[PDB]
């Protein structure tokens, strides 16, 4: 009698999930935007006031995007003008609004087309990178000192990465780093002079005459990759009269010998800052831990210090060598690293030593380090229950390893066994966020205690218009294979029926290090079409999945296109063969490298599957970027691995096309996986005589979200799947 | 049963179509190719010889893709390494072989990468373009001549074209021209220096790792075009000074006021060349008639010889002014202009005297003067029975014009009303090739008594497998719309029957001058809907279409996108009230033009639809080339015509599709109609919310004409149809 949960209520977003984005600025207070006013809260009593007016800037005349308040309180940078790059990547224009006396800086403002900024760590200072160049002010309304001089578009990166650092590396656009105290600030910097570029069209609105064409430096597998700089440069010591001096701290010589990338960089204290080099073949890295020599005024980094980490079985760290974490001294830190059993856990380190101690062990892993006191580490792992696909915060007394206490676990087993969280300044403070299995739950603790201060939002509201819904419900649970259990979940239809047949959707992604298969509340397409459609959406983790170990996760190591492929195959084999699935009615599809393992199960000759859908795949390795790709692939050389590289191709199965139902989709200006890809394929399918169905988005990208493309996506993949299940 | 015709006999080509292809060597003598045996045939007894045995190249080491023999039979030039660019452009690698000595030249070789190659018109001299350059060889064997130095890719092409004058121009590459009997050159020079360019990605094959750009001078509507100049050299002096002179032969004063085009190139005598300039507002063009001064060694074209052609309903031409045929004495001379009527006829012309006398005359049209001798003038037209759609060869005495003779109405009328011409080097033999309505026939006749000499090809082989099969009909006929005849085609099914309702497909081009109804036997695409899938293919001549006077072709003028649209839903229209058609199964589909115009139709909110298929279609004015849409749009300024070039878009239009379906098909690599007219057409959909059908189809052109890319579309396009028409 009431209403499903319909294509219409995904594209327009009828059901909405309350959230609570707080941002701590102290030990014992925090930000949180309110009725577009922002308030700040008092955690332990839950009182609050208006730290900004929604109306103060009224008469502004442009839209703000977002703010940002300088870590004392005295200032608010206001973005606006936003204009997306890549992934993380954009330019916007500030303004610096005085909070104290109440007005908006107009002297020696932040230029235009500004490429990225950041507040120092504590104080009111300012780095922001233009036209590729870094430079700092210290005071707001200060003129800037130029900190780098090289700075030229596609070529020379100061303090912001290129294409494939901010894609596959730092997962930002910043190359920036603050010394705690803001006395120093580091940076990166990247040379792609010799990086081929990927050139593509763009078409852009009608009145435009002449399509535009767009170069990104991009290095393909095997190509010549950018290389980098490290420097370090002292902010107080800054003249009006003469250019900044930056100091270098160069890599290895371990890493110096070929190729390599800067992969990480977190300060220890105000005159220690560590740094990790990967080689380009990514299973060796090397950490090295510099001091400020202040005699000389430059950086050394001990060779005793050094650190070396590496693997047998595959690449070094789930997608890059991990993070440390230093202590208050920082002369020790922690770190996750896979063990001899091949799991993720935290290792403990001094310094100058090079045997680091395990602090936690067992057949699960540590997701990451999310707060350090002299007394405990707190961190996130996915041991509660064996579940891998479940998430909770514990705590481990640092004097006594054997105390591991779980702080989120039993707080409401029922509703929550996914969370992550954020604590205050000096970890006197914690916000649990829980997505799922239930409606998400955001709440708030003391640390002396674990107290349950209070709920910051439960999401009543939408669990009251949920149900008025039918909305389909989510089972996990795992298969096993050769002594080994594999998880997989299902979003089965309201009422559902094991007596009845139902048609079944393989959603896949099945990346290396990927996790399909959790205990995660989701409100999106797979929800509508078990709910209105009746149509059973699976997930399945196999082999190279993550969170598991490296036994699992290593097991596609150099052989991308084999084992995730199959093992896709293979559940969907045991999934047709439980009685409430139609084996008549099987398909499976997937995004980005679900979109890859879609189309190589769909050209695998298993039979399996009566149709599929591939959004924006990798078609053959060799087009994919370096980084990515060569961590998993190893170089496309015959001395190296080019033999799989030439056989894990989508293309080279064109011919078993034949017997299934092809969607093929892409944007055509998706400046990760190349349009490229997917124009390599179909004309594989001509060239063999298969026809199929295709669908081109001028002008988007790899998320094809712009809102009209997203909802023509999903609108036109709705068609395509009742079509092939013979759905009314 | 007798089995129909296919979508697989189309594809595979099972009924092939035989004909006769010869090429003149002299006033009786032809070359034609039997089991790749070129063989020399006498004309008036049909007795032949081998000229060339087919094993004479086996050694070559190559496969020959064309051969050409000079003038006086001394030498054969083989063209190899053919490498497609445009329409008619091409680069091939090039022998010369001695048939004399029967050996192949080996010294002073024709460059690999040569862009154009031609005899001269008498004897053996050969002039090619090599790196946009002219070159020219007395002898095979001896060294070559420069001609020019300005040479530059894609900025100065001296002796070819650039890519607008190819297409939309000359029809051809070359641009240059030998005198009668090969004394001078004649050449044309291009310069695209501020001509924008097209840019568009080409994927080549799997192997290469990045995408090309392919890059080229075109100018689009409105934009910078190339701008040219007309040289002649003496070839007889290059053996006699170190550096011939290129003397030029200036534009008039007329056509130097502004931007214009050098439109046509015919020399008179050996002495004596004609060329014809256009205005960029093609409705005004000049002739000039110039001498060579062999006292000064210039051209001087007296203003006495000049000859203006305007006009006041549209441009000038069916597509560009037409070409002058001199009389031996370079004195006067034939040309087709339209009549006071607005019907195109044979004007003679004396070089000195401006008003010319009109030869034929009538509701009709000279389609073309195929030859000229001293005492009758050969011309096709479509005079008899007053079928525009039809082309019958005709001879005019010059000494009384009262006499004319139709030389093929009669020959075979029920099957043959569609002829074409090839005259020896004396016109004193002719071959007709008639192509239709019945299967195609080849003839040859002598000149002197207009006998029937004999049957070349008359096809008896397929009408004889034509018997087994199921073929459909075609009528040809037409429908008054305001006292005006505007004629129609239909290939319909086998045992029709106007009793019953069949579903009917509109083919449509409707471009202007263009010709959808005719009487030319076809085996195509239409032949297996109707034969095989019982469905009516219909085509329709509105205004706007050719060899009807200038009323009905110029109707258009200056507004492209109405006319000729709205004229094709009313033929619909009218079909329907002819009883046997289901009006709830009215389809549309067109390629290029014809893709314009069906997107037009189906988002012209009629409700006569139900779905259609544009192939590579034009969306936007703009986007398309400035000498084929300038020719009819005028300049897209406020000025001139831009409120209209605004308004005929398929793109506004983009909310009225959702009353229909829409398959929507572009080659990737089209250097013609860009890709980027559908990739509008796509997001201007999907910003309205509009589903419908795409493909694209990877590094194909405009023909989209690949051997599996031409199956691949055509069976895509057929399960669309039968889709819609919901036909097993
Ligand atoms: C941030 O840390 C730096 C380094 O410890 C501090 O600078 C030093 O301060 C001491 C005491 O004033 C001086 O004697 C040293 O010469 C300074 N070293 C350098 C490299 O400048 C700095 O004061 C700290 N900043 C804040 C705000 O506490
Ligand atoms: C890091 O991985 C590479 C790639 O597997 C290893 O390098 C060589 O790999 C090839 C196979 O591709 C073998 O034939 C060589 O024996 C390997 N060693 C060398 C020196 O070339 C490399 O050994 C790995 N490093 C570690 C520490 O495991
Ligand atoms: C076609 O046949 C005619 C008639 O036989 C050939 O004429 C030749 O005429 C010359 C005169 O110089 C005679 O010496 C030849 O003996 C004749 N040929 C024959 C076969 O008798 C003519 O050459 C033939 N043409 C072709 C292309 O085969
Ligand atoms: C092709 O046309 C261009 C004009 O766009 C000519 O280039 C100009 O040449 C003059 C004289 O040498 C220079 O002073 C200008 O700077 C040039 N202008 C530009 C935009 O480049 C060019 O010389 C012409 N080429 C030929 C062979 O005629
Ligand atoms: C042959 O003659 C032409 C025309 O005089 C020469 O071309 C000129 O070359 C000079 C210097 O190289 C340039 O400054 C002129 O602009 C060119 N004019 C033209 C129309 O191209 C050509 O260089 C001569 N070739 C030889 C071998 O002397
Ligand atoms: C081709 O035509 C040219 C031009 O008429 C001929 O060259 C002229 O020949 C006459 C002799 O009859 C001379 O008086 C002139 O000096 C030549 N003019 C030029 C520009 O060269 C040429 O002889 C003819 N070729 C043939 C093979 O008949
Ligand atoms: C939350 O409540 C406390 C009182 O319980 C507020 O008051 C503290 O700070 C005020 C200004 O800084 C003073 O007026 C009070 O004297 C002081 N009280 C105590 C016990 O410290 C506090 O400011 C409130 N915080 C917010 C963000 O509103
Ligand atoms: C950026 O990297 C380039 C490439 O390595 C550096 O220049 C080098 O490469 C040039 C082009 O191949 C050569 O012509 C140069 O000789 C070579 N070395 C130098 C010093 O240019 C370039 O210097 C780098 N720029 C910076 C700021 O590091
Ligand atoms: C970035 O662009 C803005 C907008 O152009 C600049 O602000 C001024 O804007 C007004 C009108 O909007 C113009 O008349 C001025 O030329 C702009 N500049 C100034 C100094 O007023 C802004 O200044 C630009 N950023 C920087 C650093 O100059
Ligand atoms: C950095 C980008 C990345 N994203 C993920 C990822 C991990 C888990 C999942 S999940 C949670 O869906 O399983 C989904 C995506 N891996 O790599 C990566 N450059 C990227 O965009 N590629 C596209 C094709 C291959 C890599
Ligand atoms: C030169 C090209 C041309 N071809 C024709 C033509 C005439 C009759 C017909 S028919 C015989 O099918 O009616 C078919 C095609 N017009 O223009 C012209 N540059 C071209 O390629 N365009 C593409 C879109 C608009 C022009
Ligand atoms: C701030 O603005 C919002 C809308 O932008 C408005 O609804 C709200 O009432 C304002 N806040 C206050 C305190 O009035
Ligand atoms: C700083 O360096 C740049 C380029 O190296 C130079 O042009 C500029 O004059 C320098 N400024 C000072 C103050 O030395
Ligand atoms: C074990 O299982 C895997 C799949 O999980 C299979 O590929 C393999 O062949 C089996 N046997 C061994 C020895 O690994
Ligand atoms: C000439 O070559 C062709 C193609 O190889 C062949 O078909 C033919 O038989 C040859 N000529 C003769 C007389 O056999
Ligand atoms: C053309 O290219 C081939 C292949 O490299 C070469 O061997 C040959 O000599 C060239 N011919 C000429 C005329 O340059
Ligand atoms: C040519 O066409 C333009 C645009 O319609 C017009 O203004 C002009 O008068 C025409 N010229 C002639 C000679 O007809
Ligand atoms: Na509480």
């Known amino acids: 009698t009431r209403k499903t949960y319909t294509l219409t209520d995904y594209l327009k977003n009828t059901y909405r999930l309350k959230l609570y984005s707080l941002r701590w600025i102290s030990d014992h207070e925090y930000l949180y935007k309110q009725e577009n006013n922002i308030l700040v809260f008092n955690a332990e009593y839950g009182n609050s006031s208006v730290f900004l007016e929604n109306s103060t800037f009224d008469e502004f005349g442009h839209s703000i995007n977002d703010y940002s308040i300088s870590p004392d309180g005295q200032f608010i940078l ?32 932040i230029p235009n087309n500004t ?3 950041t507040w120092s760590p504590v104080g009111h200072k300012l780095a922001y990178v233009w036209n590729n160049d870094i430079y700092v002010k210290i005071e707001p309304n200060l003129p800037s000192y130029r900190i780098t001089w090289t700075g ?42 010799e990086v081929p570029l990927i050139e593509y069209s763009f078409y852009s609105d009608e009145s435009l005459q002449y399509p535009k064409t767009v170069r990104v430096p991009y290095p393909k597998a095997g190509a010549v990759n950018p290389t980098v700089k490290f420097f370090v440069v002292n902010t107080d010591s800054l003249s009006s009269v003469t250019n900044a001096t930056s100091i270098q701290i160069t890599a290895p010589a371990s890493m110096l ?28 890295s090397v950490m090295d831990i510099c001091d400020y020599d202040e005699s000389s005024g430059r950086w050394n980094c001990l060779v005793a210090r050094q650190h070396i980490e590496m693997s047998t079985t595959g690449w070094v760290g789930r997608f890059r060598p991990s993070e440390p974490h230093f202590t208050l001294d920082g002369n020790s830190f922690y770190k996750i690293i896979s063990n001899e059993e091949g799991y993720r856990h935290i290792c403990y ?16 892993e540590v997701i990451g380090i999310e707060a350090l006191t002299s007394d405990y580490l707190y961190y996130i792992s996915n041991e509660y229950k064996g579940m891998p696909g479940g998430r909770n915060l514990y705590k481990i007394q640092l004097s006594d390893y054997t105390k591991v206490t779980c702080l989120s676990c039993e707080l409401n087993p029922e509703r929550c066994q996914y969370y992550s969280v954020s604590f205050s300044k000096e970890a006197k403070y914690y916000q649990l966020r829980c997505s799922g299995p239930g409606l998400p739950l955001y709440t708030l603790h003391s640390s002396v205690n674990d107290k349950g201060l209070r709920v910051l939002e439960d999401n009543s509201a939408l669990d009251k218009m949920l149900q008025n819904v039918q909305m389909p419900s989510k089972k996990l649970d795992f298969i096993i294979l050769n002594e080994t259990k594999f998880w997989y979940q299902m979003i089965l239809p309201p009422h559902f029926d094991k ?26 397409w797979a929800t509508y079409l078990a709910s ?25 190591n150099r052989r991308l296109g084999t084992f995730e492929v199959e093992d896709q195959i293979e559940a969907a084999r045991q999934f047709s063969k439980m009685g409430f699935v139609d084996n008549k009615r099987i398909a499976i599809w997937g995004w980005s490298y679900g979109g890859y393992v879609t189309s190589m199960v769909l050209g695998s000759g298993s039979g399996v599957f009566k149709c599929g859908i591939a959004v924006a795949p990798v078609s053959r390795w060799e087009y994919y ?14 001395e190296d691995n080019l033999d799989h590289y030439r056989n894990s191709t989508v293309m080279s199965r064109a011919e078993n096309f034949k017997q299934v139902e092809y969607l093929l989709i892409h944007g055509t200006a998706d400046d990760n996986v190349h349009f490229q890809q997917s124009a390599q394929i179909s004309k594989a399918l001509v060239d063999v005589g298969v026809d199929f169905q295709a669908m081109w988005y001028t002008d988007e990208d790899h998320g094809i979200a712009s809102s009209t493309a997203h909802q023509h996506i999903y609108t036109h993949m709705s068609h395509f799947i009742k079509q092939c299940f013979s759905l009314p």
Chains 1, 2 share one sequence.
């Open 532 to 556: 209105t459609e009746n149509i059973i959406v699976a997930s399945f983790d196999g082999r190279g999945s993550g969170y598991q170990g490296d036994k699992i996760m290593h097991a596609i």
């Open 152 to 193: 030229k578009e596609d070529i020379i990166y100061n303090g912001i990465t290129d294409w494939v650092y901010e894609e596959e590396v730092f997962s930002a656009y910043s190359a920036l780093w603050w010394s705690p105290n803001g006395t120093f600030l580091a940076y990166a910097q990247f040379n792609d002079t």
């Open 115 to 117: 490429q990225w900024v």
């Open 499 to 524: 007596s009845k047949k139902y048609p079944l959707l393989l959603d896949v992604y099945a990346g290396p290090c990927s996790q399909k298969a959790d205990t995660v509340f989701r409100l999106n």
């Open 78 to 109: 206001l973005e606006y003008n936003y204009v997306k790059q890549w992934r993380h990547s954009y330019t916007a224009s500030y303004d610096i609004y005085d909070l104290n006396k109440r007005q908006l800086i107009t002297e020696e403002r």
């Open 257 to 284: 010998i070929g190729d390599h990338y800067l992969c990480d960089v977190t300060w220890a204290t105000q005159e220690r800052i560590s740094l990790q080099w990967l080689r380009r073949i990514q299973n060796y």
């Open 349 to 364: 380190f001094q310094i100058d030593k090079k045997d680091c101690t395990f602090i936690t062990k067992g057949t699960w």
């Open 625 to 638: 970027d370096s980084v990515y790709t060569e961590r998993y692939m190893g170089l496309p050389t015959p």
